[PDB]
Design a protein around this ligand. Structure first.
Ligand SMILES: [Ca+2]
Length: 352
């Protein structure tokens, strides 16, 4: 099955001929991927020689706990991450229950990559792109059931006063189809881009069943293309939520917003505002803003907020099958399905 409930359609490494490998450390993952490029005769194969399902059993709680206790010492350290570059055979990196990582996963020019059940937090190297997950020039990637966290805080004197920590799930380039689902993202200042610049526009991304809590912004910072955000729980958003820019289109349906500032907006460019189609959220009209503590702020440059809470454009027919539960159900049940150690459980209307 290649069904991710979103734009990406991939089975990752769970295909025919997949080779199962256990990784006990960051280094093992690197070595395993490196060996997966060799054919029977020891010669390298472009895109990889065989599919892989890597089970990561490592635990780096010590590193995570030390980092949490000294958050401002993280940005200047060397970034730590496993790069999955030009591997198209199909790969799934799934964490064992109880595993943890103080390193990121950087996907570059690959495809059919799935990252599940990984608990990644307080990564070093914010000043040198220490992303928890980065998807660059990579279509058909599925980031599902992970816990990505740090501290929603900015230390004094970091480069650009924005590098205490990098992002949770940055997406850029030709990452044409991506599904980000069932993740528990908390304590993150910059959650994730959708295009690295004003010119890096496009892509079709689906954000569904994610639980955001105490995050500052970029859910995502969208640039062009299509974004389908459904069944997500957005609470304690301290800056802005979905920032639809460079003429992007978004379908925001059956989500639960609460204690959020600028939950849906288009700001920082001063032009080429994106559009949104709102339907089925806990917020149905401006009268609900006070009920759920929705706050709005202006910007120094021309901007568009959804303070009228009305659709400002259209959205193409959703190309895949999905069935959202109600916004009330995500509020009630989502926390028990999102993140790690949930055995990749999915929230169905049956459980509502
Ligand atoms: Ca980044």
């Amino acid at each position: 099955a290649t069904d991710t409930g979103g734009y990406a359609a991939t089975a990752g490494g769970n295909v025919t001929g997949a080779v199962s490998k256990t990784a006990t450390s960051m280094q093992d993952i690197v070595n395993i991927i490196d060996a997966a490029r060799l054919d029977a005769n020891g010669k390298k194969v472009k895109g990889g020689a065989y599919p892989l399902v890597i089970t990561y059993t490592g635990n780096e709680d010590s590193l995570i706990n030390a980092a949490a206790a000294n958050i401002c010492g993280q940005w200047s350290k060397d970034p730590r991450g496993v790069e999955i570059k030009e591997f198209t055979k199909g790969i799934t990196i799934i964490g064992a229950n109880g595993s943890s990582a103080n390193f990121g996963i950087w996907i570059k020019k690959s495809s059919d990559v799935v990252v599940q059940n990984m608990r990644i937090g307080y990564l070093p190297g914010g000043a040198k792109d220490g992303d928890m997950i980065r998807v660059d020039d990579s279509p058909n990637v599925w980031v599902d059931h992970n816990e990505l966290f740090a501290a929603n805080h900015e230390c004094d004197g970091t480069p650009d006063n924005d590098t205490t920590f990098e992002s949770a799930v940055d997406i850029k380039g030709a990452s044409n189809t991506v599904t980000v689902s069932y993740n528990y993202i908390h304590g993150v200042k910059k959650v994730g881009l959708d295009g690295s610049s004003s010119s890096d526009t496009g892509r079709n991304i689906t954000y569904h069943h994610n639980y955001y809590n105490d995050v500052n912004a970029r859910l995502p910072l969208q640039r062009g293309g299509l974004v389908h955000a459904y069944n997500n729980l957005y609470t304690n958003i301290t800056g802005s939520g979905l920032n639809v820019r460079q003429n992007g289109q978004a379908l925001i349906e059956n989500n639960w917003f609460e204690k959020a500032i600028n939950p849906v907006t288009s700001r920082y460019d001063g032009k080429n505002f994106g559009t949104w189609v709102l339907k089925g959220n806990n917020i149905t009209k401006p009268a609900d803003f006070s009920t759920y503590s929705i706050t709005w702020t202006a910007d120094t440059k021309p901007y568009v907020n959804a303070d009228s809470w009305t659709s400002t454009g259209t959205f193409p027919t959703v190309a895949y099958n999905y069935s959202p539960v109600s916004a009330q159900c995500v509020k009630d049940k989502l926390p028990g399905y999102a993140g790690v150690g949930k055995n990749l459980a999915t929230l169905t209307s049956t459980a509502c």
